Amino acid sequence: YPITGDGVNCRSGPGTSYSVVKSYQKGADVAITCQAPGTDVKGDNIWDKTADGCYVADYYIKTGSSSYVTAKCD
Ligand SMILES: [Zn+2]
């Protein structure tokens, strides 16, 4: 799914307390392997684990939902 934020952090866990691993530019498109609850970002507290293995706040990914579109991370 595509990134909608203008430079979005990808963190080592589902929340803003976790270290930043890398970033994506707006219009990057990422594969989401699973989703996990975490810090609320503007009403969406889901975090999306990408194929890079780090988590992007779902607020900044265009999935057409503020809830789950994939399996919950185990
Ligand atoms: Zn995609």
Author numbering: 1 to 74
From the paper:
Muramidases are N-acetylmuramide glycanhydrolases which cleave the β-1,4-glycosidic bond between N-acetylmuramic acid (NAM) and N-acetylglucosamine (NAG) in the carbohydrate backbone of the bacterial cell-wall peptidoglycan. Here, the identification, characterization and X-ray structure of a novel fungal GH24 muramidase from Trichophaea saccata is first described, in which an SH3-like cell-wall-binding domain (CWBD) was identified by structure comparison in addition to its catalytic domain. A ‘domain-walking’ approach, searching for other sequences with a domain of unknown function appended to the CWBD, was then used to identify a group of fungal muramidases that also contain homologous SH3-like cell-wall-binding modules, the catalytic domains of which define a new GH family. The properties of some representative members of this family are described as well as X-ray structures of the independent catalytic and SH3-like domains of the Kionochaeta sp., Thermothielavioides terrestris and Penicillium virgatum enzymes.
Attempts were made to crystallize the full-length enzymes from T. terrestris and P. virgatum. The crystals of the T. terrestris enzyme contained only the catalytic GH184 domain, which was closely similar to that from Kionochaeta sp. The P. virgatum crystal, in contrast, only contained the SH3-like CWBD, which was similar in fold to the GH24 CWBD. Again, the aim was to crystallize the full-length enzyme, but as for the T. terrestris protein the domains were cleaved during the crystallization process. In contrast to T. terrestris, for this protein the crystals contained only the N-terminal CWBD. Its structure is similar to the CWBD from the T. saccata GH24 muramidase. There are two independent monomers in the asymmetric unit with a zinc ion bound between them; this zinc ion is a crystallization artefact. Two disulfide bridges are present in the same location as in TsCWBD, which could add to the domain stability; however, they are not likely to be essential because the structurally similar SH3 domains lack these disulfide bridges. The second disulfide bridge could, however, play a role in target specificity because it brings the C-terminal loop into close proximity to the binding pocket. In addition, two ethylene glycol molecules are bound to each monomer.
